[PDB]
Point group: C3
Chain length 58, copies 3
């Protein structure tokens, strides 16, 4: 059914996908753990290695 | 696309949201991390720190 | 809102649904935690204990 993944308030994330060196974002933070991060960028929810993500506390 | 996050069977979760002292729930458990849990309450999927969550075995 | 959970590239997962002994899949891998994995099988996103999942790097 329809649902919404509420982001972790007061955080924004810049990230890189796979091997592309371009920074993407800012994006929302959904989860962090196991040396990885879950981000939501518009309608796309992606898993990114922690060192491929810059987390910023607004 | 359209999808459903199936809850972890035989568990319910009461949780505290943001700055409201009243407990919400019972909600579904989607994921149990070491420091936080992912819950689903109706169409809302939220990340709650373990200290603000009460996992019930039913 | 509408969104898509992008899978972790180059992984295929076979799994069992709790009691049912029949193997299901191939499914996409969304998250590999400690003790469990999150998989997507068409419209269903499920949490599977690690012992009940076979992750294949292809
Ligand atoms: Ni729709
Ligand atoms: Ni979803």
């Amino acid at each position: 059914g329809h649902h919404h993944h509420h982001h972790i308030q007061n955080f924004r994330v810049y990230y890189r996908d796979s091997r592309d060196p371009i920074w993407k974002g800012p994006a929302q933070l959904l989860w962090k753990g196991e040396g990885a991060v879950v981000i939501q960028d518009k309608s796309d929810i992606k898993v990114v290695p922690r060192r491929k993500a810059k987390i910023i506390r607004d």
